[PDB]
Design a protein around this ligand. Structure first.
Ligand SMILES: [Mg+2]
Ligand SMILES: [Mg+2]
Ligand SMILES: [Mg+2]
Ligand SMILES: [Mg+2]
Ligand SMILES: [Mg+2]
Ligand SMILES: [Mg+2]
Ligand SMILES: [Mg+2]
Ligand SMILES: [Mg+2]
Ligand SMILES: [Mg+2]
Ligand SMILES: [Mg+2]
Ligand SMILES: [Mg+2]
Ligand SMILES: [Mg+2]
Ligand SMILES: [Mg+2]
Ligand SMILES: [Mg+2]
Ligand SMILES: [Mg+2]
Ligand SMILES: [Mg+2]
Ligand SMILES: [Mg+2]
Ligand SMILES: [Mg+2]
Ligand SMILES: [Mg+2]
Ligand SMILES: [Mg+2]
Ligand SMILES: [Mg+2]
Ligand SMILES: [Mg+2]
Ligand SMILES: [Mg+2]
Ligand SMILES: [Mg+2]
Ligand SMILES: [Mg+2]
Ligand SMILES: [Mg+2]
Ligand SMILES: [Mg+2]
Ligand SMILES: [Mg+2]
Ligand SMILES: [Mg+2]
Ligand SMILES: [Mg+2]
Ligand SMILES: [Mg+2]
Ligand SMILES: [Mg+2]
Ligand SMILES: [Mg+2]
Lengths: 294, 159, 139, 169, 33
RNA sequence: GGUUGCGGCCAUAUCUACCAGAAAGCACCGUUUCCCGUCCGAUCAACUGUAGUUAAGCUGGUAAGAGCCUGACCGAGUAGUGUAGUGGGUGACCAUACGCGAAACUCAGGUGCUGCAAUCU
RNA sequence: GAGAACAGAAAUCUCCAGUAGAACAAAAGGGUAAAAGCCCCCUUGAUUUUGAUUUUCAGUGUGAAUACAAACCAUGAAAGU
RNA sequence: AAGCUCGUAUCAGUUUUAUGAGGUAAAGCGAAUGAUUAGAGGUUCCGGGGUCGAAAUGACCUUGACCUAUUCUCAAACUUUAAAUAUGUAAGAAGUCCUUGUUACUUAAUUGAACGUGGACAUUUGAAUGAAGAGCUUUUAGUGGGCCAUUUUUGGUAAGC
């Protein structure tokens, strides 16, 4: 387009921070998260990073260093098969699941886990996992939304309620839990609970095979071909929690081929770039090409 | 009439550098400051809270206090015929650590760690810095270096 | 310059502009030395020692006209101003030998009064579609 | 080559620039409503012009945004009126295109005198699948050059389906 | 309901834009007969 | 080595055009019951990961490409300046002595580096 | 810059560009782009108590400002403010 | 002026080393801004004066405006760059290291933050030079018209202004 950038323009142009270009960091709220009270010194602020890719859920407890942010421990939804969730791995329940996993998984490796049980009961209700006088204090973590909109009933606050239920003091309020009726200035513990066990994938599931045979065959091609009944759903999620509070400890993957291997193939689809003589050569020819006015 | 407002004459002093405007990076908030540290005052004109007075710009002092979002710097001002003591309450943006000092400690380590293998070899320490001394004799070689003698040039005009 | 040799025989260009404003108190009992900032009283052009004041380009043979035609201006300027024969081809840079090299090399392209040069720098694409004769077999 | 880089209407936008506030504006509003079956948006004056009759923040015009298969039918109902002929103008260099009609009763729609007759602007905007890249909050990027709507493209489109004429130069 | 389009731009001055000026027009113009 | 999440420094990273991209990933992409937001499920919310594609994003490669970064006895010991004289000159100004020393100009080189965590023929 | 009935230089609509060339009571200067600007939602931290501090300085007053302490509040999912 | 406390202290109208702050000189304007001479090329399909079939929502047009690449000249209240001279701080016993006490602050945490007990470190104990001794309290005279020269510099035509 004939709005080509003047050379003045390019020269006085001041670039944003790298990740401000990529649109991945809100450096405004980053600063206000990371910054510790100065007379608390080397005390790290710990962040509940909760990101949602298209097919996964990413949870990380992270702090900050000048040489770079440092992660205490990370859990993903894509782990959830291991604890018996193999469908709907980005829905609300997965979030609560993942939030609970990273809950245990951390203060396990902090050894705070025996004390600070969280809930186990989970009848869905607003409460903060707070401390036991004469004993230590709960591990404190601050929710880092990212760039996610703060909408009442948002997947991101699933992970929150998953994690607070896991026993991390992660300070929050209700009005973004599903079941918050603004007219009421209140919260339905019922609905909030439902989601935790996936009641909205359940109710929708039944309505489909009793409304639209084919459309249900596709949305849920998986559950069928796996014989998960519509209402075995809760027991899956319910049984996952067990399984999770059971062995939270991170098992990695088993990966064929070492780093060296993986490496020496993957970006040996690398375009290696020309060398000086070669490039000048490439150009010297380029001239004699166009050289001869036409 | 004359102006002597608090930020007068500071048009270039409290200006942000070329193509280095905007938001302040995070390394600044990640520095830890203890009492007794030596800092450098250098205002940041965008962060207008906790701002130093234009005087203290370019000065250097000791932290007598540490608070929520600011450090208390001591600076010795000269007023009249005699230095006085100024207590600054500045925000973390307007502060660096003094390299010159944050080295010194490393010489202290190293100077007192020459002392390590010093006694543990029984020999002489010899620590105090001694300044550049006159050269010692040399013997420059003529080999591949037959002095290439030069001479003044004529005058000439190129307009 | 004209009469003697012709409206088309030379290019005269004044190489300094009157940019500096001059002031007068203007002493119109009176007013005195009180409040003496002056009104603008005309402009002038600040000139260093060594600084070209007039420049002229004309045909190699019209030399003696211009000179004793710069001289006739010299007498209107306060101070010592020398007259000089520039060893460069015209109002350009480059000594007359060095200019003719870049002429029969094609690296020169008659512009508007002045002239554009071929660079070994830009986009080889339109370096060539700008300065054909450099790149064509020509002669 | 050419698979996921298909070619769709991004949206249609009907805009009646009434030129006054008051009953006429709320009447032209009624019209735009009965055509999209959505509820329309009113525009306020940018500034004042004596020789136009408006004063700043007087509510002059009204428009509506229609997307999807409805806008497809309404665009058809429109081209219906211009007898499937547009000019090589009408086509933004940036892929889009537009046209206008006077008398809205000319595309379906019964009379209703209590309403009156309004004319309108039909501006449809074109793009491709993948446009979200330039609209999403997180990781907002821009279309590839070899993608994105040129005018040649979305005029040779407009001859293809709809089967119409682009005229003039 | 009454729905109001929000004008992003930062201008407050009830004033015709630089892009006004009665110079530039036409000797032409639609003159119905 | 590729990729993603959170980063540090914040153009050697930006800009323009063109190409190429295995695998995983990211993605675009399917749907509107449900929480939630719109004039407009476009954005925002939720459901599926099922129906489809690397076209775009994204990552690289190309360019006597714009910009940006580094160097050089390239300009230049120039311009400017601290110190000395009962130095020169009618003066504007200049040179010398003990020292500091630029910018534009030109030329050559370069076009992201990297911390944590997860994952991948 | 390219486009849309009445619509003209100037009404309303869409797209592309756009480092700020806009805006932020005012003088000018500094500062600011997922803001410090524009739209919206919620509010009274423009509140309570007296001490420390920077500027002008005699290192008196005044005006103004900065960082804490101890309260009581506002707001946000929160860190925070 | 009176002294007082002490007696080589840690001082200094100085240099060095390390590391800060600065926007003047110069410079720049085919770099932002504001000025400024000149052509050249291209735009208008959207200011426009005609000629050509009054013809012109058709042409060749010189003229603007505007674009692009160039050219000459400037800035106390312009600027990317950017000196010289000046200017801040540091160069240890009030220090360093080890062990582990204190507390209501602080931390997920005997975690930190301060403040310490006990132990190890005395040749140059942490640059040069100097030190005619250092530190400290009280109290009171006169003064509170200044002028001159080198350089930097403002008003003025200028001035022994
Ligand atoms: Mg936010
Ligand atoms: Mg409801
Ligand atoms: Mg692995
Ligand atoms: Mg003044
Ligand atoms: Mg910026
Ligand atoms: Mg304030
Ligand atoms: Mg007066
Ligand atoms: Mg006056
Ligand atoms: Mg507005
Ligand atoms: Mg706009
Ligand atoms: Mg790697
Ligand atoms: Mg719905
Ligand atoms: Mg969608
Ligand atoms: Mg969404
Ligand atoms: Mg991306
Ligand atoms: Mg280049
Ligand atoms: Mg000198
Ligand atoms: Mg003398
Ligand atoms: Mg000289
Ligand atoms: Mg237009
Ligand atoms: Mg008040
Ligand atoms: Mg006495
Ligand atoms: Mg100044
Ligand atoms: Mg100058
Ligand atoms: Mg310069
Ligand atoms: Mg200029
Ligand atoms: Mg250039
Ligand atoms: Mg200046
Ligand atoms: Mg010494
Ligand atoms: Mg006295
Ligand atoms: Mg007195
Ligand atoms: Mg003297
Ligand atoms: Mg002097």
């Amino acid at each position: 387009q004939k709005d080509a950038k003047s050379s003045a323009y390019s020269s006085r142009f001041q670039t944003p921070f790298r990740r401000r270009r990529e649109g991945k960091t809100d450096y405004y709220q980053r600063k206000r998260l990371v910054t510790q009270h100065k007379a608390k010194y080397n005390t790290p602020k710990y962040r509940l990073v909760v990101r949602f890719t298209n097919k996964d859920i990413i949870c990380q407890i992270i702090s900050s260093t000048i040489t770079g942010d440092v992660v205490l421990a990370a859990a993903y939804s894509h782990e959830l098969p291991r604890y018996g969730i193999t469908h709907g791995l980005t829905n609300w329940a997965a979030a609560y699941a993942t939030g609970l996993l990273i809950a245990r998984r951390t203060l396990q490796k902090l050894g705070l886990d025996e004390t600070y049980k969280g809930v186990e009961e989970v009848e869905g209700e607003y409460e903060l996992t707070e401390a036991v006088e004469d004993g230590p204090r709960p591990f404190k973590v601050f929710l880092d939304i990212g760039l996610q909109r703060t909408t009442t009933g948002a997947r991101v606050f699933g992970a929150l309620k998953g994690a607070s239920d896991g026993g991390l003091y992660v300070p929050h309020s209700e009005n973004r839990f599903p079941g918050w009726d603004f007219e009421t200035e209140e919260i339905d513990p019922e609905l909030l609970r439902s989601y935790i066990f996936g009641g909205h994938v359940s109710q929708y599931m039944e309505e489909l095979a009793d409304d639209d045979e084919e459309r249900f065959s596709e949305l849920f091609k998986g559950y069928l071909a796996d014989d998960i009944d519509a209402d075995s759903l809760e027991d899956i999620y319910t049984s996952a929690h067990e399984a999770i509070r059971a062995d939270p400890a991170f098992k990695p993957t088993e990966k064929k081929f070492t780093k060296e291997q993986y490496a020496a193939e993957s970006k040996k689809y690398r375009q290696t770039k020309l060398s000086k003589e070669e490039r000048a050569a490439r150009v010297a020819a380029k001239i004699a090409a166009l050289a001869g006015q036409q | 009439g004359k102006s002597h407002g608090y930020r007068s004459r500071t048009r270039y002093m409290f200006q942000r550098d070329f193509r280095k405007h905007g938001a302040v990076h995070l390394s600044t908030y990640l520095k830890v400051y203890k009492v007794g540290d030596i800092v450098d005052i250098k205002a940041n004109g965008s962060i207008q809270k906790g701002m130093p007075h234009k005087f203290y710009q370019g000065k250097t002092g000791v932290v007598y206090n540490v608070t929520k979002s600011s450090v208390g710097v001591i600076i010795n001002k000269m007023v009249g015929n005699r230095y006085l003591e100024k207590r600054l309450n500045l925000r973390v943006e307007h502060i660096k650590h003094s390299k010159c000092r944050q080295e010194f400690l490393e010489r202290v380590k190293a100077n007192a760690a020459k002392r390590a293998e010093a006694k543990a070899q029984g020999v002489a320490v010899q620590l105090k810095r001694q300044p550049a001394q006159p050269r010692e004799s040399r013997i420059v070689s003529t080999e591949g270096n037959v002095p290439q003698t030069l001479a003044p040039v004529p005058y000439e005009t190129f307009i | 310059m004209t009469t003697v040799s012709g409206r088309d025989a030379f290019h005269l260009r004044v190489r300094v502009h009157p940019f500096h404003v001059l002031r007068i108190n203007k002493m119109l009992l009176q007013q005195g030395m009180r409040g003496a900032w002056g009104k603008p009283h005309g402009l002038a052009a600040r000139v260093d020692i060594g600084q070209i004041i007039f420049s002229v380009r004309t045909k190699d043979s019209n030399k003696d006209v211009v000179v004793e035609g710069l001289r006739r201006a010299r007498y209107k300027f306060p101070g010592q101003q020398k007259i000089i024969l520039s060893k460069k081809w015209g109002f350009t840079n480059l000594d007359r030998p060095e200019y003719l090299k870049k002429r029969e090399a094609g690296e020169v392209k008659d512009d508007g009064a002045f002239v554009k040069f071929l660079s070994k720098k830009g986009s080889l694409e339109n370096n060539i579609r700008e300065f054909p004769e450099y790149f064509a077999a020509q002669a | 080559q050419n698979p996921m880089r298909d070619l769709k209407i991004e949206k249609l936008v009907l805009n009646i620039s009434v030129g006054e506030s008051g009953d006429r504006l709320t009447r032209a509003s009624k019209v735009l409503e009965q055509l999209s079956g959505q509820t329309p948006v009113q525009s306020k004056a940018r500034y004042t012009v004596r020789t136009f009759g408006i004063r700043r923040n007087e509510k002059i015009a009204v428009h509506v945004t229609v997307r999807g298969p409805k806008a497809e039918e309404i665009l058809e109902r429109g081209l219906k009126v211009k007898e499937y002929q547009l000019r090589d103008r009408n086509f933004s260099a940036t892929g889009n295109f537009g046209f206008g009609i006077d008398e809205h009763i000319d595309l379906g729609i019964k009379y209703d005198p209590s309403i009156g007759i309004f004319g309108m602007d039909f501006y449809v905007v074109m793009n491709r699948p993948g446009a979200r890249v330039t609209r999403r909050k997180r990781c907002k990027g821009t279309v590839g050059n070899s993608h994105k709507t040129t005018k040649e493209d979305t005029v040779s489109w407009f001859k293809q389906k709809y089967d119409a004429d682009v005229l003039d130069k | 309901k009454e729905i109001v389009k929000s004008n992003t731009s930062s201008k407050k001055a009830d004033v015709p834009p630089p892009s006004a000026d009665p110079s530039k027009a036409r000797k032409n113009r639609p003159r119905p007969s």
